[PDB]
Design a protein that fits this description.
The structure is a homodimer.
Chain A lengths: L2 E4 L1 E6 L12 H10 L2 E6 L10 H14 L3 E4 L1 E2 L18 E4 L12 H10 L6 E4 L3 H12 L4 E3 L5 H12 L4 E5 L2 H4 L5 H8 L9 H9 L6 E2 L8 H4 L11 H13 L5 H16 L8 E11 L18 E11 L2 E5 L2 E2 L22
The complex binds zinc ion (6 copies).
Subcellular location (chains A, B): Cytoplasm; Nucleus
Organism (chains A, B): Homo sapiens
Subunit structure (chains A, B): Homohexamer. Interacts with CIPC.
């Protein structure tokens, strides 16, 4: 007996095209998404070149329209030079992303005043997402309050962070957040196995106490999202390993395992991978779209999943219960039992759908 | 013709007793204060042992009562273990100090949740001061808002910081701040002369643009305070130089020079070294207390000032106009032309004066 789920949404993926296509591209990353039961993804802007101006966005849109196998929206990225310049293209993006901790030169903001400038100039009705760790979460919350608008905090990883967000919500502040599977299912205890290279991720893996705090505060978590951040094994195992884990193909099986163990309900899962992503990012429904999963199938995660070009996984050896059997996307079979059956280019930019525009006052 | 000023107050000094008395002690540091026209000081808690519990405060109070030549109040310091434990002694302190960036093990807070715990437990009517740089200013402002109370930000040093505080004040938030003389009168341009050891200070010296921003935003600055942070030349010039500059003896002459040049008025100076310190920290008046200064005397700052045991100064070679001629403290001549004339122990704990208790609801 299969369970039918709606089309799941991952609001935080790095698909590496343009500029890092040995790590992943739109075609491989969206194949990974479909195999993980994900029918819509929001792609981050830290590509090469990064998506920080209209021409880069235009290029990315065409690459995605030509390569994506599932539907998508593309983020713009905040830079030290582009505040006040994105107004005409802002509505065509998933939202604006601010990289407030480590990142490359082009996306680095050197002052909180630059954060404020973005919050002041980006259209008030459109999403803003921050990569913000530890005290940076409090700092960007302050900027959001000074500018009287909302903010979404990516990949909350620590007890410190989830409790701060909990306190902000208790004061009625408009903040939402997401948690990634590696911060629910891996911890410091796994660093021995992973090693210092493969184990490199930002936010870093937390303590057992951090992991337990995220589970205990599930009510505070609005979304799950993978932070799919593919890098090859050569890169992860080399002299200056980049941070990040691939995660599209493993996210749903890990979470289904947790549902089977009664750690959260099926509804808790669907709020966090479907309804809340829709409502926070104003993402449209997908007609005739659904995912069929088998909740009884027990398997062990292998050394690499079939589709991501990362060709490794930090969850290797974990036992899971739950697997994606079939995905239907807009009336076409997109995935069955290990085979992707829609071509590159089948996917569409949801921000171009009439129902995918974010409502605003005239 | 001498100008009579009221007794000036420095709300931010490190007097190093107990535990660092080769760098300074109460007797030498308060001699330096008097020579700088300062009749009341608030001493920071990062001594050895640090002032983080009632017994350490009791010791510090007696050392100060025995050694101080001017009047004083003593800060308590926040630790990872003392939130909720300081209620009985809190009112006897200048306030509570939080070290939110670099500091030693005992005063290190590892989580914003610990900041929140202090803001929640420290009596709401008593001062809280934070060492907070760059985004940490925004973060502690957020904590202050979540807990619905005020905060005072020490030594603002950057354009980024003063503009953030300016924005917070424009939203009506209860925040005050201070600036130290080295951030008004020194910059990156001086690092060549000072070298990497002597030049070490936290917050670090700013760019010319940082300095210009602080002057342009003088209206946002509530207090001046020295952050007198004495270390010996051997320490500053050695392999792991501690951050900090001595500043009690040079602060007023530097600022009087600026008054003479019309960079700020005498009133602007007295608001920031007398009236605002009084009102932010609820410090009592000092009867029959005043400072006589000569505004016409031109001199060059030497390689060390007479009183601080630091025995060096980063302002060496700067030309100033303005000098302290006489100080009278509670009806006794305390300083004349280079000679301190009150003994160690003349100074008193102002929090023990009836007028020095902070008013509170019953
Ligand atoms: Zn991130
Ligand atoms: Zn990311
Ligand atoms: Zn539903
Ligand atoms: Zn400080
Ligand atoms: Zn200090
Ligand atoms: Zn006055």
């Amino acid at each position: 007996k299969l369970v039918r789920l709606p089309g799941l949404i991952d609001v935080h993926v790095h698909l590496r095209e343009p500029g890092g296509t040995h790590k992943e591209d739109f075609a491989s990353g969206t194949a990974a998404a479909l195999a993980g039961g994900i029918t819509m993804v929001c792609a981050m802007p830290n590509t090469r070149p990064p998506i920080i101006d209209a021409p880069a966005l235009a290029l990315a849109q065409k690459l995605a329209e030509a390569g994506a196998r599932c539907d998508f929206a593309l983020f713009l990225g905040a830079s030290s030079e582009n505040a006040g310049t994105l107004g005409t293209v802002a509505g065509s993006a998933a939202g604006l992303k601010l990289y407030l901790n480590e990142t490359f030169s082009e996306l680095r903001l050197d002052s909180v005043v630059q954060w404020m400038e973005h919050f002041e100039t980006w259209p008030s009705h459109l999403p803003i997402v921050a990569h913000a760790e530890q005290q940076t979460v409090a700092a960007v919350l302050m900027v959001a309050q000074l500018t009287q608008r909302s903010v979404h905090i990516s990949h909350v990883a620590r007890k410190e962070e989830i409790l701060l967000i909990k306190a902000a919500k208790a004061r009625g502040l408009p903040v939402t957040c997401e948690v990634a599977p590696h911060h629910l299912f891996l911890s410091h205890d796994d660093l021995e196995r992973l090693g210092p290279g493969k184990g490199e991720v930002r936010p870093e893996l937390g303590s057992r106490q951090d992991v337990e705090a995220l589970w205990e505060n599930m009510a505070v978590i609005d979304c799950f999202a993978s932070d799919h951040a593919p890098h090859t094994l050569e890169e992860k195992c080399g002299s200056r390993p980049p941070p990040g884990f691939p995660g599209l193909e493993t996210m749903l099986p890990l979470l289904l395992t947790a549902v089977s163990e009664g750690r959260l309900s099926l509804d808790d899962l669907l709020q966090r991978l479907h309804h809340n992503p829709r409502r926070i990012f104003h993402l449209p429904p997908q007609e005739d779209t659904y995912v069929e999963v088998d909740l009884e199938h027990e398997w062990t995660i292998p050394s690499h999943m079939p589709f991501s070009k990362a060709h490794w996984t930090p969850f290797e050896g974990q036992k899971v219960k739950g697997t994606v059997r079939r995905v239907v996307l807009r009336g076409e079979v997109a995935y069955i039992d290990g085979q992707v059956l829609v071509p590159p280019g089948y996917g569409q930019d949801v921000r171009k759908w009439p129902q995918g525009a974010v409502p605003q006052l005239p």
